[PDB]
Amino acid sequence: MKKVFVLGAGTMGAGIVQAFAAKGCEVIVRDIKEEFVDRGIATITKSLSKLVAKEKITEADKEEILSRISGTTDMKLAADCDLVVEAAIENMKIKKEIFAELDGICKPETILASNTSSLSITEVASATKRADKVIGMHFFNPAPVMKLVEVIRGAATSQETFDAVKEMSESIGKTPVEVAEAPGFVVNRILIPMINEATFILQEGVAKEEDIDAAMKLGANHPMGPLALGDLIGLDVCLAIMDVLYNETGDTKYRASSLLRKYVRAGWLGRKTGKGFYDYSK
Amino acid sequence: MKKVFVLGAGTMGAGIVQAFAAKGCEVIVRDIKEEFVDRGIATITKSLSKLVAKEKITEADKEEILSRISGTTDMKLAADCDLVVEAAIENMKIKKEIFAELDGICKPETILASNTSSLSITEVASATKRADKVIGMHFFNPAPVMKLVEVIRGAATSQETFDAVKEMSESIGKTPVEVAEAPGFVVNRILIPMINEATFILQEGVAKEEDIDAAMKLGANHPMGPLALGDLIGLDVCLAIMDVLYNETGDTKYRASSLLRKYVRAGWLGRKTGKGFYDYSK
What residue ranges do the domains of chain B occupy? 1-187, 191-276
A248 belongs to the catalytic site: no
Cβ neighbors of B241 (< 8 A, separation 6 or more) are B117, B118, B184, B188, B192
What span, in angstroms and rounded, lies between the C-alpha atoms of A215 and A208? 11
**A83 pairs with which residues across the strands?**
A4, A111
Residue A91 marked as a ligand binder: no
Looking at residue A113, the DSSP 8-state letter turns out to be: E
Q: Please check whether residue A17 is in contact with residue A6, taking contact to mean a CB–CB distance below 8 angstroms.
A: yes
Beta strands across the sheet bearing B134-138: B69-72, B26-30, B3-7, B83-86, B111-114, B134-138, B148-153, B175-180
A138 belongs to the catalytic site: yes
Q: Please check whether residue B52 is in contact with residue B62, taking contact to mean a CB–CB distance below 8 angstroms.
A: yes
Cβ neighbors of B259 (< 8 A, separation 6 or more) are B199, B200, B202, B203
Residue B267 marked as a ligand binder: no
* Length in residues, chain B: 282
The resolution in Å comes to: 1.8
Q: Domain A1-187 maps to which CATH number in 3.40.50.720, 3.40.50.620, 3.40.50.920, 3.40.50.10540? A: 3.40.50.720
Q: What share of chain A is helix, strand, coil (3-state, %, to 5)?
A: 50, 15, 35
Q: Which residue of B lies nearest to A202 if distances are taken between CA atoms?
A: B186
Distance of CA B129 to the CA centre of its chain: 25
Distance from CA of A272 to the nearest CA of B (A): 20
Beta strands across the sheet bearing A26-30: A69-72, A26-30, A3-7, A83-86, A111-114, A134-138, A148-153, A175-180
Inter-chain residue contact A215 with B191, CB threshold 8 Å: no
Out of A118, A120, A169, A188, pick the active-site residue: A188
DSSP of A62-81: HHHHHHTEEEES-GGGGTT-
- To test the contact with chain B by mutation, choose from A186, A232, A246 the residue with the greatest count of B C-beta atoms within 10 A, namely A186
Query: A-chain residues within 8 Å CB-CB of B189?
Result: 197, 201
CA distances from B253 to A165, A233, B223 (A): 35, 24, 26
From the list A175, A191, A253, which residue is nearest B252 (CB)?
A253
Distance of CA A116 to the CA centre of its chain: 6
From the list B140, B204, B215, which residue is nearest A187 (CB)?
B215
Looking at residue A253, the DSSP 8-state letter turns out to be: G
Report CA Rg, chain A: 20
Query: B-chain residues within 8 Å CB-CB of A191?
Result: 216, 219-220
Q: Please check whether residue B74 is in contact with residue B44, taking contact to mean a CB–CB distance below 8 angstroms.
A: no
From the list B175, B178, B191, which residue is nearest A220 (CB)?
B191
Q: Which of A223, A233, A224 is nearest to A276 (CA)?
A: A233
Distance from CA of A136 to the nearest CA of B (A): 14
Distance from CA of A33 to the nearest CA of B (A): 31
**B22 pairs with which residues across the strands?**
none
Which CATH number describes the domain made up of B191-276?
1.10.1040.10
Distance from CA of A214 to the nearest CA of B (A): 8
Looking at residue A23, the DSSP 8-state letter turns out to be: T
Give the burial string for A215-234 (b: 16+ CB within 10 Å, else e): bbbbbbebeebbbbbbbbbb
CA distances from B129 to B87, B95, B125, B156, B279 (A): 21, 15, 8, 11, 48
Whether the link from the prior residue into A223 is cis, omega within 30° of 0, is: no
What span, in angstroms and rounded, lies between the C-alpha atoms of B69 and A143? 52
